[PDB]
Amino acid sequence: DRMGANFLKVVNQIKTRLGANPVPLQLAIGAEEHFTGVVDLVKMKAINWNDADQGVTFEYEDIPADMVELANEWHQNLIESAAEASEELMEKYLGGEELTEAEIKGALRQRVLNNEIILVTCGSAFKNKGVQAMLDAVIDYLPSPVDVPAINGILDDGKDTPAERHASDDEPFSALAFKIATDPFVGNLTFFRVYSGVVNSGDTVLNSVKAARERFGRIVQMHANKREEIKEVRAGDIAAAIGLKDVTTGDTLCDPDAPIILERMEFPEPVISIAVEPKTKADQEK
Amino acid sequence: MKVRASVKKLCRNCKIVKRDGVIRVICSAEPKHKQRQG
Amino acid sequence: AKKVQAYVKLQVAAGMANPSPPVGPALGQQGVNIMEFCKAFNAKTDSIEKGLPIPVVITVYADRSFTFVTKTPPAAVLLKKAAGIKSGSGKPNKDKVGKISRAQLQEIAQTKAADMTGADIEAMTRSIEGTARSMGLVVED
Amino acid sequence: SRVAKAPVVVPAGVDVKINGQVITIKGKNGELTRTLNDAVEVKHADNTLTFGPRDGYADGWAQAGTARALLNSMVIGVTEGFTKKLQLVGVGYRAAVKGNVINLSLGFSHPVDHQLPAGITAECPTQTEIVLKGADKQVIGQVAADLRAYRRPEPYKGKGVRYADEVVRTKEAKKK
RNA sequence: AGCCAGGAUGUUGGCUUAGAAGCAGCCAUCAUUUAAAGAAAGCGUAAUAGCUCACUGGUCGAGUCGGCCUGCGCGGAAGAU
């Protein structure tokens, strides 16, 4: 909703600078100030938004008459994007079997596990124009923890046997340690995410890469700000693996007699170095 | 336009024309080389 | 040959494949693949013992084309290839070290006579005596 | 002089109305008249126009030296014309022609739409390029320079409105 | 004085070569062709590509140019019922 904001320029600028292959889907209706419609091209439906409300309507209509031909020349490039994704849609682009909304995404979802095309969407966050539109693609173009290759614990030093473990609750427990913040209540905190398996409350969770013993305290979830005590952590939640005695960047959070990860890749280098000096001589003690 | 009593032809391509009577000296790329009095 | 578009003669010792930064721009004038000028000259560079600056000229053409002329190394660096040091000009008329007679100068001029139409034998002889006096070198025969 | 060695050749298709000091040129698409000063002696001699400085006003070599350059431009301006293109380099800045009015997307809290006088057929191939067409050499610059004076060429980015042939000198920040 | 107009081309011009590559600066300060070119004036610039001065080589086809002396003129020149 700004001047100079050409949607078709930027997505066709990626093919020049970033060198990628983007085929966009949700196009633009409106001259950026009277902007009212976002042109979803699979279902060929424009969406009405709020007069100025923080979120009332979702009214779907047809393609408006002021863009009846740009929808024509851009939908035919959408339905190209499955004939060269899977080899089986090659003979019905030319034969003329109908390219429905549901059929084309079954090929393009498998085009996200290799990542040759990215899926683009224009709209406004602040003007409440597109946010309610942007959620339905996440369940259909962004991958799930059970649709991906799951936890792959290799071994330790014996042999390189990468083992795809299960994404369900039927595995040994596994997690990782990252975003390990602090607090003046308990000391150390984490923002950890469990990939599969279920843990109960109270566990001898180790950190099996650095040979240390830790015990699993009272886990707390947030609204990104507020303390909500999560007792039973299910497979896929993100919480605070509290009470770790020592913890490093990206080591395992795993019960013994189980698969084990040992992985720390791209340890950075903080470059600019400034020397802090105390104010009082009581300060250098603290 | 800086003012000073001396208009000295300073830049290599410095035009001089008498607009209104008071001399002001015309460079091309340098705005710094333009005086007006004298 | 050509005109106000482009004509600069700059090439230094051809043991270095990568275009040296100051030479870069004479290759950075009319859109070359810099791998092409590396692959053009190396078929004949394996007939030399490298160490002297060998010159080429660049000359251009309309679409994406270009051309270049191969000659022999100049006698100015041939004066200071035999003399051992590459830079002797510290004081021209106050240094008297190092002699080469005219016979060396003409046999490095036959390779000019077998390559180029200017830089003739007898006319360059005083300038190959003139690059000696500026370096502070002596000549006798 | 050089101007005295410069007579102007009127072609067929442009008619002169010599009422002495007042000449009204009947041309192709307009009427380019100039009421000159009395330091001139005008005569459309055969076809090539000849002029002369009047006595007393011996500085009329200047005052008709303007005129020799003047009427040459007038007979070629009423027929062929001037392409005066301007280059809009501004973040979110557009240009669009309707009737005889130009919009000015000029980074303000309010739109500026100024109506442009006669002797102007303006056009706009895009949001950054804008044609101006005219018959007098003065009017093809005067309406052009007013737009350029609303947003002068900024010499830290290259921002501003600028002519087609004009080349700015943009500098560098050099401190922060 | 302008439009075409080559900026004929030996060379990297050293030093000290990291670039001080005609264009940072000290000593030389020759010129292969001299109907047009200096081992050189600035900008582009770490260096150069870009743009010129150099001779205007070809067109206009007549006057033109830089200083010395005086007659006068302009600026310099802003004050308080």
DSSP D41-108: --EE-SSEEE--PPSS-TTHHHHTHHHHHHHHHHHHHTTT-----EEEE-TT----EETTEEEE--SS
Is the Cβ–Cβ distance between D84 and D132 less than 8 Å? yes
Which strands make up the sheet holding D18-19, listed edge to edge? D18-19, D22-26, D31-35
Question: Does D72 lie in the same domain as D13?
Answer: yes
Minimal Cα distance from A6: which residue of D?
A: D92
Torsion, CA D33, CA D34, CA D39, CA D43, rounded to 10? -20
CA separation for the pair C122, A186 (Å, rounded):
95
Is the Cβ–Cβ distance between A167 and A150 less than 8 Å? yes
Task: Count Cβ atoms within 10 A of the Cβ of residue A239 and give its class: 0-12 exposed, 13-18 middle, 19 or more buried.
Answer: buried
- Residue A1 is labelled as binding a ligand: yes
Residues 6+ apart with CB under 8 A from A43: A60, A101
Is the Cβ–Cβ distance between A67 and A29 less than 8 Å? yes
Cβ neighbours of A4 in D, within 8 Å: 91-92
CB–CB contact A4 D105 (8 Å): no
Residues 6+ apart with CB under 8 A from D173: D156
Q: Which helix H or strand E contains C131, and what residues bound it?
A: helix C127-135
Q: Return the CATH number of the domain spanning residue range C72-140.
A: 1.10.10.250
Residue limits of CATH 3.30.1550.10 in chain C: 7-71
Question: Does D88 lie in the same domain as D57?
Answer: no
Q: Which has the closest alpha carbon to A188: A245, A239, A226, A231?
A: A245
Q: Which has the closest alpha carbon to A44: A58, A26, A63?
A: A63
CA D140, D131, D106 angle in degrees (round to 5)?
95
User: Is the distance between the Cβ of C84 and the closest atom of strand E smaller than 7 Å?
Assistant: no
Residues 6+ apart with CB under 8 A from B7: B16, B23, B24, B25, B35, B36, B37, B38
CB–CB contact D91 A2 (8 Å): no
Question: Does D52 lie in the same domain as D90?
Answer: no
- Distance in Å from E70's C1' to D58's CA comes to 26
Question: Does D86 lie in the same domain as D51?
Answer: no
Q: Which has the closest alpha carbon to C43: C74, C18, C70, C79?
A: C70
Structure tokens at B13: 């391509």
Is the Cβ–Cβ distance between C91 and C136 less than 8 Å? yes
Burial C12-48 (b: 16+ CB within 10 A, else e): eebeeeebeeeeeebbeebebeeeebeeeeeeeeeee
CA separation for the pair C45, C40 (Å, rounded):
10
Q: Which has the closest alpha carbon to A46: A31, A34, A58, A32?
A: A58
Q: What is the DSSP string of chain B?
A: -B--S-----SSS-EEE-SSSS-EEE-SS-GGG-BB--
How far CA D37 is from CA of D2, D16, D56, D67, D139, in Å, comes to 21, 17, 13, 9, 20
CA of D94 vs chain A CAs: smallest distance (Å): 9
CA D36, D38, D43 angle in degrees (round to 5)?
75
Question: Does D42 lie in the same domain as D26?
Answer: yes
How far CA A248 is from CA of A55, A181, A245, D43, D137, in Å, comes to 43, 12, 10, 99, 77
DSSP β-ladder status, C66-70 and C56-60 = antiparallel
CA separation for the pair A227, A51 (Å, rounded):
36
Question: Does D34 lie in the same domain as D98?
Answer: no
Q: What is the DSSP string of chain A?
A: --TT--HHHHHHHHTTTT-------BEEESSSSS--EEEETTTTEEE---SSSSS----EE---GGGTTHHHHHHHHHGGGGTTTSSTTHHHHHHT----HHHHHHHHGGGTTTTS----B--BTTTTBBTTTTTTTHHHHS--TTTS---EE--SSS----EE--SSSSS--EEE-----EETTTEE---EEEEE--B-SS---BBTTTTB-------EE-SSSS-EE--SB-TT-EE-----SS--TT-B-B-SSS--------------------SSTTTTT-
Beta bridge partners of D81: none
DSSP β-ladder status, D48-50 and D43-44 = antiparallel
**Residue D101 falls within a domain, yes or no?**
yes
User: Is the distance between the Cβ of C6 and the closest atom of strand E smaller than 7 Å?
Assistant: yes
Question: Does D149 lie in the same domain as D105?
Answer: yes
Count of residues in chain D: 176
Beta bridge partners of A199: A233
Compute the count of residue pairs across chains A and D with CB atoms less than 8 Å apart: 7
Is the Cβ–Cβ distance between C59 and C1 less than 8 Å? yes
Structure tokens at A99: 């390219």
Name the one residue in this structure whose structure tokens are 């190394």: C73
Name the fold adopted by C7-71.
Ribosomal protein L11, N-terminal domain (3.30.1550)
CA dihedral (D141, D142, D146, D149) positive or negative: positive
Torsion, CA C40, CA C42, CA C47, CA C53, rounded to 10? 90
Q: How far is CA A240 from the centre of its chain?
A: 19
User: Is the distance between the Cβ of C59 and the closest atom of strand E smaller than 7 Å?
Assistant: no
CA dihedral (A54, A59, A65, A71) positive or negative: positive
Q: Give the residue from D19, D46, D76 where a domain finishes.
A: D76
C76: nearest nucleotide, CA–C1' criterion: E11
Q: Which has the closest alpha carbon to A192: A206, A208, A174, A204?
A: A174
Q: Which helix H or strand E contains C125, and what residues bound it?
A: none
**Residue D54 falls within a domain, yes or no?**
yes
For chain C, the distance separating the N- and C-terminal CA atoms, rounded to the nearest angstrom, is: 39
> For residue C50, which phi and psi values (nearest 5 degrees)?
-70, 160
Number of domains in chain D: 2
Residue limits of CATH 1.10.10.250 in chain C: 72-140
DSSP D126: S
Q: Domain containing D59: what range? A: 8-76
**Residue D111 falls within a domain, yes or no?**
yes
Name the one residue in this structure whose structure tokens are 């070359």: C32
Q: Please give the single-letter amino acid code of residue D55.
A: D
Q: Please give the single-letter amino acid code of residue A267.
A: F
DSSP D25: E
- Distance in Å from E70's C1' to D53's CA comes to 32
CA separation for the pair A11, A120 (Å, rounded):
8
Name the one residue in this structure whose structure tokens are 């943009």: D170
User: Is the distance between the Cβ of C31 and the closest atom of strand E smaller than 7 Å?
Assistant: no
Is the Cβ–Cβ distance between C12 and C41 less than 8 Å? no
Minimal Cα distance from A32: which residue of D?
A: D92
Question: Does D72 lie in the same domain as D88?
Answer: no
Task: Kindly report which amino acid residue has its CA closest to the C1' atom of nucleotide E12.
Answer: C12
Question: Does D26 lie in the same domain as D89?
Answer: no
Q: Give the residue from D76, D111, D132 where a domain finishes.
A: D76
> For residue A244, which phi and psi values (nearest 5 degrees)?
-80, 130
Which CATH number fits the domain that encloses residue D36? 3.90.930.12
CA separation for the pair D92, A33 (Å, rounded):
13
Beta bridge partners of D43: D50
Q: Which has the closest alpha carbon to D121: D103, D138, D98?
A: D98
Question: Does D95 lie in the same domain as D52?
Answer: no
Is the Cβ–Cβ distance between A45 and A37 less than 8 Å? no
Torsion, CA D25, CA D26, CA D32, CA D36, rounded to 10? 20
Minimal Cα distance from A4: which residue of D?
A: D92
- Against chain B, the chains showing at least 3 CB pairs within 8 Å are none
Minimal Cα distance from D105: which residue of A?
A: A3
CA separation for the pair A153, A185 (Å, rounded):
34
Is the Cβ–Cβ distance between A140 and A109 less than 8 Å? yes
CA separation for the pair A188, A49 (Å, rounded):
44
**Residue D169 falls within a domain, yes or no?**
no
Q: Give the residue from D76, D98, D117 where a domain finishes.
A: D76
Nucleotides of E under 7 A from a protein CB: 5-17, 19, 21, 27-33, 39, 42, 44, 46-51, 61-64, 74-76
CA D103, D107, D108 angle in degrees (round to 5)?
85
Q: What is the DSSP string of A126-168?
A: TTTBBTTTTTTTHHHHS--TTTS---EE--SSS----EE--SS
Question: Does D86 lie in the same domain as D65?
Answer: no
Please give residues of chain B from 11 to 30 whose alpha-adjacent beta carbon (CB) lies under 7 Å from any atom of strand E: 12, 21-23
Q: Three-class SS of residue D32?
A: strand
Count of residues in chain C: 141
Question: Does D49 lie in the same domain as D110?
Answer: no
Q: Three-class SS of residue C34?
A: helix
Beta bridge partners of D98: D101
Q: Which has the closest alpha carbon to A131: A13, A26, A24, A5?
A: A26
CA separation for the pair A98, A102 (Å, rounded):
11
CB–CB contact D91 A4 (8 Å): yes
For chain B, the distance separating the N- and C-terminal CA atoms, rounded to the nearest angstrom, is: 13
CA separation for the pair C57, C118 (Å, rounded):
15
User: Is the distance between the Cβ of C134 and the closest atom of strand E smaller than 7 Å?
Assistant: yes
Structure tokens at A89: 């849609």
